[PDB]
Paper text:
[FeFe]-hydrogenases represent one of natures’ most effective classes of redox enzymes catalyzing the reversible reduction of protons to dihydrogen (H2) at turnover frequencies of up to 9000 s-11–3. With their low catalytic over-potential, [FeFe]-hydrogenases represent excellent models for a regenerative and likewise economically feasible H2 production. Their active center (“H-cluster”) can be structured into a standard [4Fe-4S]-cluster ([4Fe]H) and a diiron site ([2Fe]H). Theoretical studies suggest that the most probable PT pathway comprises of strictly conserved residues E282, S319, E279, and C299 (from surface to H-cluster, numbering corresponds to CpI), including two protein-bound water molecules (Wat826, Wat1120 4XDC19, chain B) located between E279 and C29915,16,20. In this study, site-directed mutagenesis (SDM) is used to investigate the PT pathway of two [FeFe]-hydrogenases, namely CpI and HydA1, which represent the largest (M3) and smallest (M1) type of monomeric [FeFe]-hydrogenases, respectively.
Residue numbers in the entry: 2 to 580
């Protein structure tokens, strides 16, 4: 219980690692491959090296403290070891930060500066083509940056339990990649991008849509609509040193105008649309007394999980399009009818916290009359890069508002970005629809928060119903495999692939791992959303006035006829085959 670190004595009953004990006691220990409570078991980076008297050099991140330990974190032996390991990394690292997309927030660069490290022989490949894989609609790899730290492999395992990201033996050398070095899209990968979030450097990235967007903007005849996800207004401010949990909605609208977008709408409008359709489908099922359960279908990471692991549930998914695609569909049909635009000249761009959204947008059948629902999807990070490249002073911009026709949104739509958000929003409408009433108690705190699996009983029209909120792809696996699905009859289930909801999406700003233990990123980003909900006068999707008018004037009644024909999408399992 007694340990000495750099000459300082501590008394403690704690059972923890040297790294965690030292950092709790404000002692600096560097780390690289340690993240998500694990390190690279096979190829330890050893950046967390410390000296334990009587033992030698040990890795602090996976060595437990023991009574009587005398530890030096900053001896010559230690600093030369760490510097040596960083130098070896530089030997396989294309160290050219100028045009690098992690230039502003790279963990490796920070370590190189800290230890004054240099390559024993600079790595300068002639042909990066063999190092880069951009076949995916969603994820790209640049192995000239890869430190083989395993953080993406561990994060895939931890977050999704698919292990789609693996170590591979290629040409007799170790790389990371997909099963058999396939394109990720052709594997059980969810394209959720949690591996990207985990990456300390620029080796993993989103598939860029930025030139699709800039081309559309500069095309004379193109009318470029832009619309951002719920999570974007709660996040993007982090990349302009505005801190965490800042609502920057009004600034984003202003910046998008300054970027030259022709119409400023909002995906939250599409969220209200999804609710209109999905809550209607839920009431339909309640009155048909089936089929049950109905699952949400707005998360393309979860749709891919269902496709790849549970195709028997594909017919249990709501046929309502996701906020992105339903908005997109409306952008090519309703929007011209109220604007005069030639549908073929409309180019619809979304801004998402999500890499999987790019795959969804590019699904061959997400189209009508030769017109894509969505033409481009850029991540939070990409929009930040566009803003910085345009030299727009984001933090000092005035607030503007969205164009109302497809920009208004309710508080129900606003909270989509948090785990349990869709559930809560959908219940607010379904209850009003089924009872043909406008109920006052609308908050469903039971489905909120970061618990991995959330259940609640709701009563609708003198009948009790069972709902569940699955928070993260690994938790969907747990729910199903453990038979939790069978311990009662579920009627409506929300699934999000990313733990925390879209606020923790694969397209979101990276956050430093130590600032990550300072701030709960999942809760602080979500707090912006719930707070908008609390202060909006319209808190149900079906009270959205521009939505109501669009339905009254163009689509008709949700869930039926026109709305069904246009605003819905069904996923179908493959017929039985041998082999
Ligand atoms: N389409 C859509 Fe969604 C909405 O609204 C986003 O835009 Fe999400 C967010 N934020 C993302 O990415 S998707 C999963 N449904 C919940 S939130
Ligand atoms: S990954 Fe980091 S260290 Fe490597 S070139 Fe990019 S910014 Fe520089
Ligand atoms: S995108 Fe998601 S599922 Fe695919 S390798 Fe990365 S973490 Fe795993
Ligand atoms: S892609 Fe990134 S997280 Fe994965 S091993 Fe390479 S450097 Fe580490
Ligand atoms: S939870 Fe949100 S960000 Fe994550 S994969 Fe699903 S839609 Fe994308
Ligand atoms: S951080 Fe401890 S071995 Fe990598
Ligand atoms: Mg370990
Ligand atoms: Mg233009």
């Amino acid at each position: 219980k007694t340990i000495i670190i750099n000459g300082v004595q501590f008394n403690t009953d704690e059972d923890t690692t040297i790294l965690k004990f030292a950092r709790d006691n404000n002692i600096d220990i560097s780390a690289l491959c340690f993240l998500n409570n694990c390190n690279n078991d096979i190829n330890k980076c050893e950046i967390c090296t410390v000296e334990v008297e009587g033992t030698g050099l040990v890795t602090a991140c996976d060595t437990l403290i023991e009574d009587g330990m005398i530890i030096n974190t900053n001896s010559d032996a230690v600093n030369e070891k760490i510097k040596s390991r960083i130098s070896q990394l530089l030997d396989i690292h294309e160290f050219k930060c100028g045009p690098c997309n992690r230039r502003e927030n790279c963990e490796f660069l920070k370590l190189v500066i800290k230890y004054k490290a240099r390559a024993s022989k600079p790595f300068l490949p002639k042909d990066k083509t063999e190092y880069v894989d951009e076949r995916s609609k969603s994820l790209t790899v640049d192995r000239t940056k890869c430190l083989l730290c395993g953080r993406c492999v561990n994060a895939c395992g931890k977050n999704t339990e698919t292990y789609a990201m693996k170590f591979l033996n290629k040409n007799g050398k170790t790389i990371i990649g997909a099963e058999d070095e396939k394109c990720f899209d052709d594997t059980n990968c969810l394209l959720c991008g949690q591996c990207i979030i985990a990456c300390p450097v620029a080796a993993l990235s989103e598939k860029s849509h930025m030139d699709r967007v800039k081309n559309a903007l500069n095309a004379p005849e193109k009318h470029v609509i832009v619309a951002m996800a719920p999570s974007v207004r709660a996040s993007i401010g982090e990349l302009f040193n505005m801190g965490f949990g800042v609502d920057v909605t009004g600034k984003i609208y202003t910046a998008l105008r300054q970027l030259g977008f022709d119409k400023i709408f909002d995906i939250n409008f599409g969220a209200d649309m999804t609710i209109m359709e999905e809550a209607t489908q839920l009431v339909q099922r309640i009155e048909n007394n089936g089929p049950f359960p109905m699952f949400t279908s707005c998360c393309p990471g979860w749709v891919r999980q269902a496709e790849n692991y549970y195709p028997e549930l594909l017919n249990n998914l709501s046929s309502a399009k996701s906020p992105q695609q339903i908005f997109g569909t409306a952008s090519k049909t309703y929007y011209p009818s109220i604007s005069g635009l030639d549908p073929k000249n409309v180019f619809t761009v979304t801004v998402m916290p999500c890499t999987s959204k790019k795959f969804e947008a590019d699904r061959p059948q997400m189209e009508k009359d030769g017109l894509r629902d969505i033409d481009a999807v850029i991540t939070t990070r990409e929009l930040a890069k566009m803003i910085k490249d345009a030299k727009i002073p984001f933090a000092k911009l005035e607030d503007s508002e969205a164009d109302p026709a497809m920009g208004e949104y309710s508080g129900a739509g606003a909270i989509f970005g948090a785990t349990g958000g869709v559930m809560e929003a959908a219940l607010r409408s379904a209850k009003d629809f089924a009872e043909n009433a406008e109920l006052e108690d609308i908050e469903y705190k039971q489905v909120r928060g970061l618990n991995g699996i959330k259940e609640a009983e709701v009563e609708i029209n003198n009948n009790k119903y069972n709902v569940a909120v699955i928070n993260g792809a690994s938790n969907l696996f747990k729910f199903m495999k453990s038979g939790m699905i069978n311990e009662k009859q579920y009627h409506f289930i929300e699934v999000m692939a990313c733990h925390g909801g879209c606020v923790n999406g694969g397209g979101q700003p990276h956050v430093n791992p130590k600032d990550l233990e300072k701030v709960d990123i999942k809760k602080v980003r979500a707090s912006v959303l719930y707070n908008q909900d609390e202060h909006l006068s319209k808190r149900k999707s079906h009270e959205n006035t521009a939505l109501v008018k669009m339905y009254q004037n163009y689509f008709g009644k949700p869930g039926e006829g026109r709305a069904h024909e246009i605003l819905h999408f069904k996923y179908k399992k493959s017929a039985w085959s041998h082999p």
